[PDB]
Design an enzyme around this catalytic site. Structure first.
Site, PDB file in Angstrom:
ATOM      1  N   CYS A 228       0.756  -1.167   0.020  1.00  0.00           N
ATOM      2  CA  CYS A 228       0.027   0.045  -0.004  1.00  0.00           C
ATOM      3  C   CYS A 228       0.852   1.340  -0.173  1.00  0.00           C
ATOM      4  O   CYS A 228       0.569   2.306   0.761  1.00  0.00           O
ATOM      5  CB  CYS A 228      -0.874  -0.012   1.252  1.00  0.00           C
ATOM      6  SG  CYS A 228      -2.630  -0.967   0.916  1.00  0.00           S
ATOM      7  N   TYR A 495      -9.388  -5.636  -8.033  1.00  0.00           N
ATOM      8  CA  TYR A 495      -8.374  -4.991  -6.650  1.00  0.00           C
ATOM      9  C   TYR A 495      -7.126  -5.877  -6.530  1.00  0.00           C
ATOM     10  O   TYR A 495      -7.188  -6.848  -6.322  1.00  0.00           O
ATOM     11  CB  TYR A 495      -9.215  -5.103  -5.250  1.00  0.00           C
ATOM     12  CG  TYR A 495      -8.755  -4.147  -4.382  1.00  0.00           C
ATOM     13  CD1 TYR A 495      -8.694  -2.646  -4.620  1.00  0.00           C
ATOM     14  CD2 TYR A 495      -8.240  -4.598  -3.179  1.00  0.00           C
ATOM     15  CE1 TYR A 495      -8.314  -1.949  -3.570  1.00  0.00           C
ATOM     16  CE2 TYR A 495      -7.735  -3.732  -2.228  1.00  0.00           C
ATOM     17  CZ  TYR A 495      -7.985  -2.275  -2.529  1.00  0.00           C
ATOM     18  OH  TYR A 495      -7.578  -1.491  -1.572  1.00  0.00           O
TER      19      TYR A 495
END
Ligand code: CA
Ligand code: CU
Length: 639
Positions: A228, A495
């Site tokens: 992330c 995703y």
């Protein structure tokens, strides 16, 4: 774990052969439906013949095969796990062609999979090229082959998917290593999980397009779990990876030495922020409330020369926040950032409001108007994509996304934004009639010819679920202001998926999932080969060659002279890419204005403005009259 793209083919009439099999561990123990029985190659009194070892299946009739699975031994024995491997398909059982899938499986006892484009086959062959920890043996408790419900030949002229690259991790973040041509990938502290990380560890994997080799590394030297993160290639030719699971950390990947180097901590802890390389080679970042806390995280800037982060508190994040129902946790995520002139950064979305960010003094922000067209004001487009396909003319194509990060319908909205000088409100228009398929969590790359390839995603954003998938990619062609559907693939890429342009002109698309013991991890990638690499008969076209360059490193404004083996019509520079969570702030394209010296010698100037020609590594492509690109020549652009 993971999953196959098809349903299991019944095996009760299969015939199987193995290169060797120990008594009691026969070849057919791998298809008897018994989890406790296994095939095992020779050992002990039979000697210990080393890999490659081979498992071949005659399914008797043609099946529409789209994958296989391997269940390892379940008795705690770890010495026969398959590492490097290849999967082959055949209709006659003698001619096997090129592998439909190849790569490396992670060293553990979990079920492994090879998923690939559907192909009619009667015979299936698995080659174990290495054992996962270098031992002599191969074993399999259960092997299965999967079928699609149908098969459809690819349409001529619409590109081709394949092969699959099997990986030991879920590649939710990736970059091209420009000095080596390899694809660098990473997950988190684990191969498929980020949840409950102690921090300080990133698992990485690399794929070499030249050799097909998949390798892996555990990176601890930077004390950074890089799941992330922000990602930017800075002007010093190092990839700056920021925050994420360790929200304050900065790590530097150096392509030249193929190593990771500790960087300074950011001033503000962040996750899911975007970062963008600037005209002066520095890196700007803003937002990122996924980790490090949920509060207003204004700008800050990294200097590669002083090795510092400096806060820019007056580069305010507030004007770029979306109206996400979940609030700040999401609303400052994944900005559509582009480095531009005089140290500025353009923010194109996902918020309706577009903004100019400035990096002088303690920072500034100025409204650039709303993304809109004669169809109306464009809604928030979280995890929409933005691609600068003509940096000389300031052209940015934006598309897809949804008003909220999740549980929100994606759209077909698409725009062309045309940048002028910092502080001016750019013209925005609708792109064609929009996407064919509404999608979010899709990914995209600009191609040598200025077209944008758009792939994957789902119609309704639901992280970690492969529902409402979009299997048909699209290409936007600017000269025609038209989108075109390409041939579809069979693996969901929603995703945590990525795409990157390869130096050879093909597209590397992979990942999806990264949710631990979820069924939606995709430990793989596929190649898309665009139509410009095929001739009228569907065979690979002859490509022009760049036979000489005057230099491989150039300052902005500088000239390069090249020789080719054939006449060329167009040329472009494409900055090398990085990718995670739909964000790629490093790619961009410069169309080149060629001078014809005659004798297939040409020259061009690199743009003098480093806000256009962002410092870093670029791919030089030349194209012939037929539209066929060369492979890339690597050019370093400095300022
Ligand atoms: Ca068995
Ligand atoms: Cu994520």
């Amino acid at each position: 774990a993971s999953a196959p793209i098809g349903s299991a083919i019944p095996r009760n009439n299969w015939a199987v052969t193995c290169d060797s099999a120990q008594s009691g561990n026969e070849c057919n123990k791998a298809i008897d439906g018994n989890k406790d029985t296994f095939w095992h190659t020779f050992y002990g009194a039979n000697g210990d013949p080393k890999p490659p070892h081979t498992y071949t299946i005659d399914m008797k009739t043609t099946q529409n095969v789209n994958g296989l699975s391997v269940l390892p031994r379940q008795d705690g024995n770890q010495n026969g796990w398959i590492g490097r491997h290849e999967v082959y398909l055949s209709s006659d059982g003698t001619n096997w062609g090129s592998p439909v899938a190849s790569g490396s499986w992670f060293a553990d006892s979990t079920t492994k999979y090879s998923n690939f484009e559907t192909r009619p086959a009667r015979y299936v062959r698995l080659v174990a090229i290495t054992e996962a920890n270098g031992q002599p043996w191969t074993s399999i408790a259960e092997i299965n082959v999967f079928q699609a419900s149908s098969y459809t030949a690819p349409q001529p002229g619409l590109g081709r998917w394949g092969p699959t690259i099997d990986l030991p991790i879920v590649p939710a973040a990736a970059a091209i290593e420009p000095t080596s041509g390899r694809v660098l990938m990473w997950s988190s502290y684990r191969n498929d999980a980020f949840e409950g990380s102690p921090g300080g560890i990133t698992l990485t994997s690399s794929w070499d397009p030249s050799t097909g080799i998949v390798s892996d590394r555990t990176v601890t030297v930077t004390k950074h779990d890089m799941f992330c993160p922000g990602i930017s290639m800075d002007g010093n030719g190092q990839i700056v990876v920021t925050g994420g699971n360790d929200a304050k950390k900065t790590s530097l990947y150096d392509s030249s030495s193929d190593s990771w180097i500790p960087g300074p901590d950011m001033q503000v802890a962040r996750g899911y922020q975007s970062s963008a390389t600037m005209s002066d080679g520095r890196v700007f970042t803003i937002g990122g409330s996924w980790s490090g806390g949920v509060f207003e995280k204004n700008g800050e800037v990294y200097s590669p020369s002083s090795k510092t982060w400096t806060s820019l508190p007056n580069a305010k994040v507030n004007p770029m926040l979306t109206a996400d129902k979940q609030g700040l946790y999401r609303s400052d995520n994944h900005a559509w950032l582009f480095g531009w002139k005089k140290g500025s950064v353009f923010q194109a979305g996902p918020s309706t409001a577009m903004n100019w960010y400035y990096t002088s003094g303690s920072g500034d922000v100025k409204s650039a108007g709303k993304r809109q067209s004669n169809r109306g004001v464009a809604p928030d487009a979280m995890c929409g994509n933005a691609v600068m396909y003509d940096a000389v003319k300031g052209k940015i194509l934006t598309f897809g996304g949804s008003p909220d990060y999740q549980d929100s319908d994606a759209t077909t909205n698409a725009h062309i934004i045309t940048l002028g000088e910092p502080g001016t409100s750019p013209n925005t228009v609708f792109a064609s009639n929009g996407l064919y398929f509404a999608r979010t969590f899709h990914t995209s790359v600009v191609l040598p010819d200025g077209s944008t390839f758009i792939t994957g995603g789902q119609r309704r954003g639901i992280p970690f679920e492969d529902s409402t998938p979009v299997f048909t990619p699209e290409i936007y062609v600017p000269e025609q202001d038209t989108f075109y559907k390409q041939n579809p693939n069979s693996i969901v890429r929603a995703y945590h998926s990525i795409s990157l342009l390869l130096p050879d002109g093909r597209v590397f698309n992979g990942g999806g999932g990264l949710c631990g013991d979820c069924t939606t991890n995709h430990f793989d990638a596929q190649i898309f080969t665009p139509n410009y690499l095929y001739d009228s008969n569907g065979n690979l076209a002859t490509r022009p060659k760049i036979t000489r360059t005057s230099t491989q490193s150039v300052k902005v404004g500088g000239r390069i002279t090249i020789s080719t083996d054939s006449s060329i019509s167009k040329a472009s520079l494409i900055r090398y890419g990085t990718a995670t969570h739909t964000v790629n702030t490093d790619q961009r394209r410069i169309p080149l204005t060629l001078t014809n010296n005659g004798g297939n010698s040409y020259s061009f100037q690199v743009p003098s403005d480093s806000g256009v020609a962002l410092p870093g590594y670029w791919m030089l492509f030349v194209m012939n009259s037929a539209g066929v690109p060369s492979v890339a020549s690597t050019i370093r652009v400095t300022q």
